[PDB]
Amino acid sequence: AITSLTTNADGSAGATVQTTRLPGIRELPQRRMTIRSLLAQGTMEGNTLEYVRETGFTNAAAPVAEGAQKPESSLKFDLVQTSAKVIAHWMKASRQILSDSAQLQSFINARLLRGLEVVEENQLLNGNGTGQNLLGLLPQATAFAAPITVANATAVDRLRLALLQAQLAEFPATGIVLNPADWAGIELLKDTQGRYILGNPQGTLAPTLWGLPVVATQAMAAGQFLTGAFDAGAQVFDRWAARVEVATENQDDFIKNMVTILAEERLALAVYRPESFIKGSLTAAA
Amino acid sequence: AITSLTTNADGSAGATVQTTRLPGIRELPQRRMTIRSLLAQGTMEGNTLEYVRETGFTNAAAPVAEGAQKPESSLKFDLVQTSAKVIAHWMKASRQILSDSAQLQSFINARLLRGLEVVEENQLLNGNGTGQNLLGLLPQATAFAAPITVANATAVDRLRLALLQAQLAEFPATGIVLNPADWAGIELLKDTQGRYILGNPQGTLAPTLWGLPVVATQAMAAGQFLTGAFDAGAQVFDRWAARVEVATENQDDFIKNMVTILAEERLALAVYRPESFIKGSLTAAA
Amino acid sequence: AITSLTTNADGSAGATVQTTRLPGIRELPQRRMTIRSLLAQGTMEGNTLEYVRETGFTNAAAPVAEGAQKPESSLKFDLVQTSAKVIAHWMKASRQILSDSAQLQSFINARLLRGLEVVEENQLLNGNGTGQNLLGLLPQATAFAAPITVANATAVDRLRLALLQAQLAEFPATGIVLNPADWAGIELLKDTQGRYILGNPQGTLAPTLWGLPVVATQAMAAGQFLTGAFDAGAQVFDRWAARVEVATENQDDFIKNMVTILAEERLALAVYRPESFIKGSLTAAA
Amino acid sequence: AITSLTTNADGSAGATVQTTRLPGIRELPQRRMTIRSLLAQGTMEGNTLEYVRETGFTNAAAPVAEGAQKPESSLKFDLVQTSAKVIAHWMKASRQILSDSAQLQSFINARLLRGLEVVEENQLLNGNGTGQNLLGLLPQATAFAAPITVANATAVDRLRLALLQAQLAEFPATGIVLNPADWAGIELLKDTQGRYILGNPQGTLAPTLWGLPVVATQAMAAGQFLTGAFDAGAQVFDRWAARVEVATENQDDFIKNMVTILAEERLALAVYRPESFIKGSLTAAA
Amino acid sequence: AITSLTTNADGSAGATVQTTRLPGIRELPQRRMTIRSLLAQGTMEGNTLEYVRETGFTNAAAPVAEGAQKPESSLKFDLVQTSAKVIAHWMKASRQILSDSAQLQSFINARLLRGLEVVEENQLLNGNGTGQNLLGLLPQATAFAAPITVANATAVDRLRLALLQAQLAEFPATGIVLNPADWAGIELLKDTQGRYILGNPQGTLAPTLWGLPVVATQAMAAGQFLTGAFDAGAQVFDRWAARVEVATENQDDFIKNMVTILAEERLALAVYRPESFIKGSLTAAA
Amino acid sequence: AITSLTTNADGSAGATVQTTRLPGIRELPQRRMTIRSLLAQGTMEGNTLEYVRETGFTNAAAPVAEGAQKPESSLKFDLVQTSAKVIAHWMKASRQILSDSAQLQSFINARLLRGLEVVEENQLLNGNGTGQNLLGLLPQATAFAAPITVANATAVDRLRLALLQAQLAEFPATGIVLNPADWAGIELLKDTQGRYILGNPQGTLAPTLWGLPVVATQAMAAGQFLTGAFDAGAQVFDRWAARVEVATENQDDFIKNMVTILAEERLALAVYRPESFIKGSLTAAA
Amino acid sequence: AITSLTTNADGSAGATVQTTRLPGIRELPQRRMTIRSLLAQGTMEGNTLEYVRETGFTNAAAPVAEGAQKPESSLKFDLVQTSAKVIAHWMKASRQILSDSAQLQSFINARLLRGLEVVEENQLLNGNGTGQNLLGLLPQATAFAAPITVANATAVDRLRLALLQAQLAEFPATGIVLNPADWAGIELLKDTQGRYILGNPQGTLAPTLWGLPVVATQAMAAGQFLTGAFDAGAQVFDRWAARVEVATENQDDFIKNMVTILAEERLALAVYRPESFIKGSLTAAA
DSSP states (O other), rough: OSSSOOOTTTOOOOTTTTOOOEEEOOOOOOOOHHHHHHSEEOOOOOOOOSEEEEEEEOOOEOOOOOSSOOOOOOEEEEEEOOBBBBBEEEEEEETTTTTTTTSHHHHHHHHHHHHHHHHHHHHHHOOOSSSOOOSSSSSSBBBBOSSSSSSOOHHHHHHHHHHHHHHHTTTTOOOOEEOOHHHEEEHHBBOSSOEEEEEEEESSSOEEEETEEEEETTTSSEEEEEEOOOOOEEEEEEEEOOOEEEEESSTTOOTEEEEEEEEEEHHHHESSSSGGGGEESOOOOO | OOOOOOOSSSSTTTTOOEEEOOSOOOOOOOOOOOOOSSSSSEEOOSSSEEEEEEEOOOOOOOEESSSSSSOOOOOOEEEEEEEEOOEEEEEEEEEETTTTTTTHHHHHHHHHHHHEEEEEEEEHHOOOOOTTTTOOTGGGSSSOOEEEEEEOOOHHHHHHHHHHHHHHOOOOOOOOEOOOHHHHHTTTOOOOSOOBOOOOOOOOOOOOETTTTEEEOSSSSEEEEEEEEEHHEEEEESSSSOOEEEESSSSSSSTTTTEEEEEEEEEEEEEOOOOGGEEEEOOOOO | OOOOSSSSSSOOOOTTTEEEEEESSOOOOOOOHHHHHHHHEEOOOOOOEEEOOOOEEEEOOOOTTTTTTOOOOOOOOOOEEEEOOOOOEEEEEESSSSSSSSTTHHHHHHHHHHHHHHHHHHHHHHHHTTTSOOOSGGGGEEOOOOSSOOSSOOOHHHHHHHHHHHHHOOOOOEEEEEOOHHHHHHHHHHSSSSOBBBTTTSSOOOSSTTTTTEEOOOOOOEEEEEEEEETTTEEEEEESSSEEEEEOOOOTTTOOOOOOOOEOOOEEEESSGGGGGEEESSSSSO | OSSSSSSTTTTTTTOOOOOOOEEEEEEEOOOOSSSSSTTEEEOOOOSSSSEEEEEBBBBBOOOSSOOOOOOOOBBBOOOEOOOOEEEEEEEEETTTTTTTTTHHHHHHHHHHHHHHHHHHHHHHHHOOSSSSOOOOOOTSSBOOOOOOSSSSOHHHHHHHHHHHHHHHTTTOOEEEEEOOOHHHHHHHHHSSSSSSSOOOOSSSOEEEEEEEEEEEEEEETTTTTEEEEETEEEEEEEEOEEEEEEEEESTTTTTEEEEEEEOOEEEEEEEEGGGGGGEEESSOOO | OSSSSOOOSOOOTTTTOOOOOEEEOOOOOOOOHHHHHHHHEEOOOSSSSEEEEEEOOOOOOOOSSSOOOOBBBBBBEEEEEEEBBBBBEEEETTTTTTTSSSSSSHHHHHHHHHHHHHHHHHHHHHHBOOOOOOOOOOTSOOOOOOSOOOOOOOOHHHHHHHHHHHHTTTTOOOOOOOOOHHHHHHHHOOOOOSOSOOOOOOOOSEEEEEEEEEETTSSOOOOOEEEOOEEEEEEEESSOOOOOOEESSSSSTTHHHHEEEEEEOOEEEEEEEETTTTEEEEOOOO | OOOOOOOSSSOOOOOOOEEEEEEEOOOOOOOOOSSTTTTTEEESSEEEEEEOOOOOOOOOBBBTTTSOOBBBBOOOOOOEEEOOOOEEEEEEEEETTTSSSSTTHHHHHHHHHHHHHHHHHHHHSSBBBTTTTBHHHHSSBOOOSSSSSSSOOOOHHHHHHHHHHHHHHTTTOEEEEOOOOHHHHHOBBBBBSSSSEEEEETSSSOOOEEEEEEEEEEEEEETEEEEOOOOTTTEEESOOOOOOOEEETTTTTTTTTTTEEEOOEEEEEEESSTTTTTEESOOOOO | OOOOOSSSHHHSEEEEEOOOOOOOOOOOOOOOOOOHSSSSEEESSSSSSEEEEEEEEEEOOOOOOSSSSOOOOEEEEEEEEOEEEEEEEEEEETTTHHHHHHHHHHHHHHHHHHHHHHHHHHHHHBOSSSSOOOSSSGGGOOOOOOSSOOOOOOEEEEHHHHHHHHHTOOOOEEEEOOOOHHHHHHHHBBOOOOOOSSOOTTOOOOOTTTBBOOEEOOOSOOEEEEEESSSSTTEEEEEEEEEEEESSSSSSSSHHHHEEEEEEEEEEEEESSSSGGGEEEEESSO
């Protein structure tokens, strides 16, 4: 009998129907990439930067008599330099594949310059600074030392101690950065009875601790926190931009009907006062 | 000794009284069958649907030297197709038994309509997908792994960990489905002193948890939960509607005084994102 | 010396003073008779009541191929019947004791039919139904089995578990019935510190719990509870009414100057769904 | 020189200054005497009051078969009688003391009238009943027994248990009476942590407990409480009123220039239902 | 060289600049002296006052038989006398010091009155009465004995027990007076955890306890308290006033150019009820 | 290949790129300059200030007998002197370094001005007064002796004891000054169950304790407090401004090509009440 | 008679002549300041200056075939730095002398400037470079090596060979600097028969040898010569100028009524190509 089969037997009649194509493409998810918005921004017109910073001030001012002579003071200075690194990548597509799927060219243009961001931020936060890498905020900040003793340390108390330590250095903190896996663990704090300190099973938690903005990014290792003033403690200078270029004659690609697409960034980072950033671990690690 | 006895003896006279009959028919109780309204609905034509998705991205971006070769990158696509299945069932009623029960016809119709919903819900929840079956949400869900370690196991804590794991993969959750027994167990959580954390003996608990709606259904085994975004994570495409037909000449039924009544639905299901659904145990089981 | 003494001594004169009688008769207090108003009321005019109920519904719906034969279903029905019982009692009094206290007859008439309600309620609530008794709600409901495990055994927890078990049978509860002593023991619930969870020494506690009304009748045994929906679960049919009648020649009471008074009830009870009633013990009993 | 001295030396002159007398007489304070207002008031015209009360009633209503015989019930009655007692006292004064201070007569009259109420209330509350005394509420009140069990013996728990015991006998309570010292001791109740339960150091406490008015009188012994309904539980009948008379020829008081004053009350007390009053001790006494 | 020295050497020139004088006199601080505002005021015209007060009342009223003699009562009276004392002092000043510093005249006048008030309050509060002293409240009030027993000795419980002891003698209190060094100790009460009972570190505490006003004065000894009804149990009578006299010829102040100033008070105190005031300590004193 | 290398190989061309200098100088932070604002300010037009105090006031004011000489008493006065002191300093700059870096004249002026105020506050706070220094508030303050004894020594308890000791001397306090480390330690105060007393992780703590404003300054050593009244307890008199002068011919600086810059302040301090300041240690130190 | 005499005799009226003074001051002779005019001029800001020098060029250009490849060339650079030096001197006069004659101040200024010019030239021609000396042209010039052999090698022959050697490196010479004594000795060269080598002494032309103008200055030591391209091989950068300053207040000059005048200058010298200068000795053996 007539059926939906598509074989070569009698009464197949399966090719009369056609498949329906659902519109759109199921794209992969992307992260938030909020690190760059914290710091200040600027431009340069070269390869290296240079700035001068004060280092000392004696201030030998004392009360003096009527006939005696006043004492003298002095001061010192120092110089700091940096450098700019470049990150780039390319991708090659044939000519027949293009102009067949209309929304692919632009698709690639959206997938290239996005991939520049991720690595860039991974360079901005924790870059070892050796080779062609960059020097990040995390491997350049100071360590966590307790100013005052507390009998039983808690993850919330340790952050307040870090704030106090940053304030004793005349550098008030402005923001906190830590892993979302730990910002959620903070919501799961218990007393010795069983109540919740910050968590609320029938609500949500605002992103604020001790009156300072707090941010969670996947680029931070689990069990670490970085606190301090970001707007006035560091800056990012853009030498080049995130432009995307198309080349149709690279190597022997003209006589093989292909094309290549390239993107590059060339940014740089400067940290004026490394002692205004505190980095530490949330766990005691006894 | 005239009594109400009906036995064949002296002075029985028990057959004079006639028993009365209470009107109406008492039926078995029903369930809710409320997982279809969670998802989205749509219409289809033909037998097969197909969609195109992105299945990879390399993003091999890295810093480069001044005169070195830039790194490569690549994309990858895939096409996934789903088919439509038919669910149907019939029963056969003698012609003489009808017209003696004036309400049997509507009862049969209602039972046939209700019988499709149960099997539809069972297939939508957890269907093997081999043969004529339909692939359901539960078999495609990812396993539950705790991102962090918590001191004491609690259903609220486990649900929060599941939400965190959902959020780590850039797939925010929207709804929770769990057994009503576990909801009652949650409502009976206490302290070390003996107070109630969420329960209210002089009231009732609202149906929400961690800002996400929670739904209780007997369709899931006790000690299991399922969290995800149903409004966009899957869809149900209907080909036919629930239809009922009555036949009097099927086979040799004209010469046997019988009728047949048959019902059929022919729906189908499409799951865009298998990784956006999390299933697991609400108890530690360790 | 004229005094108030009433002896045989000289100058007693104490018998001239009369003693007066306080009007009215002081009688014992009565009960509330709460059970009967909970259920539904009706009238019957026979000896036996019967109704038809569905017992099975074989669902065999399943997916099928394009050229495969569809499955079959089946139904069943049964009849359930009950009967009407009679409770009655009489009282015989002398003929001289009447017309001496003119109000004894009315007192006996009132008490004779007022004592029927207590036995009627006791039979309605707890009657084993074997022999001449009536089948009550208590011996026919289902025993309390814990659906989920709870570490500590409190009365409110067991009540919540009973409501959960009732809901698991797709039968929501509507009322709770238990002894007033157990409802008073609930107010005296202390923490480990010494505070009260529900009670208020300067106020009173409303007769509600978990959103369900609670009734405390002395008819319920101490240490037991019964939960369920009463309006749509069972009914009581009144065949006869409160009938009180007098007789002067019963037995040899014409040659003894006596009289007899009689009262009878002749009610019936029909229970529809024994699965919607949960009976249990408030204590752990283990 | 001239001074304020009053000796025989020269220039004393101190006797020319008199002494000012402060007007009025300072008096001892007064109690409240707030038990007579709890009971009902009545009048009697003889010496003895009698009333008939309907004691225990046993019904035997039970289900019966088709031809079996019906059960039998019975009643009982009792008659109780009371008596009237007299309380009086007199005081003797001289005629030279009178007519010197024109306010001693009214003072003695008021003192004689007031001194009766103290002993009258002492008899009404706690009267032995043996001899010429008057049987009070406390000797005939019902002892305290625990219907249910409680771990910690706190006074509020004991009062609630007493209210429960009164309610079980179908005799609701309406008032509580106890010593003010015990009320203050109840005020200073502590948890295990150290906080107050009912006492508010910056405020006061309302005169209610468990929804029933509470009265603190010095008449009740320390460590005792009496609860029940007072309006319908007893009555006081006034044969004579507070009567005061003055005599001059009494005994040989005409040749001694004296006078005598006498005061009499002659009240009586009747208790209808002796089992509606519960008496007990607040302490464990174990 | 020219300098700011004042020696006899060359180039001193330091005497050409004068010293600027800051206006006003920096004075010593004074207390409040609010003891006299607690009691009532009055005016007397002689030297001695006396009042008459009832002392006792036997009230030997008892129930009597029909023909028995009735019991006899009795009463008493007493007369109590007071006295008036004088406190005064004087100052001697040279005639040339005045009119050189114009404000010394009023300064001496104010100091005289302040010296009068301080000794007045110190004598009113506690004077042994021997010699020319005055009889104060401290050596005349009744000691403290706890009517009941409390497990934990806290100052607030001791004050409540003092109020109870005042009530048991039928003398309600109106105010409490104690050292301000103990108000802080009361404000510093803790739980067994570490919380605060009364005082909040972020506010102020109202001066009230158990509904009675609290007065803190340095005059009361540290560790002692005194409570009672001040406005009705004592009074202060003013024979003379606080006038000031100025004399020029005292002994030889006319030929030695002096002047003298004198101040006198001449007050008296009358205490009616020495049992309405209770004094005691706040510690356990064991 | 032309690159950015700077070696002696071919195609180096690394010397053609010049560094860029960021404008401005990165300077060290200030602290608060907050002590001066607490005290009151005034102006003087000389070299020495004086004021007059009254110190002793004997008070006999005793009760006197009739005909006896009244006792006498006396006053006292004295003068207090204070002198102005000059604090100043200078700095020597080469003539070559000036006019090469344009921003050194303004920088040096600003740093001299800022270094004046640090010594100003350090001398106002704790100066021993010997030599040519000032006598500050700290050495004139009163040691901390606890009036009462408190079991648990908390920082807030010690502060309350300080306010109590201030109040006992008729010198109420107005402000509190302590290290910010102790303020942070006060924020992290725990119960025994692990909760917070004053701290709030989702907010900030207002600077107020016991109704007194609190300022935290690095000037106080760790663990010290200086409770007192500042506005009316001391004053600061300014004579000279904080002008800055430049000289190009001081000594032999014309033949050495040098310049000098000088700054002078010449303030003075006058403390009226040395007894209203209580200094002490916050830690138990026992 | 009346003659122009001065003796004390008749006539002799020659003491009324008023001998006239010729305006202006005749002065010593000075050199012509030749060296500075040869080199290039420029202005500099700061203390040190840097410049980039090209130190290689391959220039692999060659003819190419029809379809052959092309060669590459490449380059290389480097960078070098130079500092600045200070030359100054001063003189002091008495403010009486330079107030009597105005022109002496201008003469002093001119003499100071001329001394600065002379010292500047002497440092430019030959400086050690150690300490604060400049690095002149002479200590940097390359040695002299004869490219062509000659028989007798007189001074003229050696100079011609030096010009040939300078030309053989694409740096044509522009002048010769040598001592005036050496130039005179060269001009007085005698032939074998008695004539002059350099033409005849009748030529009225500026000094010139081999078509190049010679410079006869005493700054260079006798017996040596320097040749090269001054106009494009060396630059003099003026940071400051030859200004003059006057100071009236100094070490102690205000007391002694003196005044000081200072003249000072800063300069730098840059030698781009040290191989463009040939230095040598005119005598072959020495």
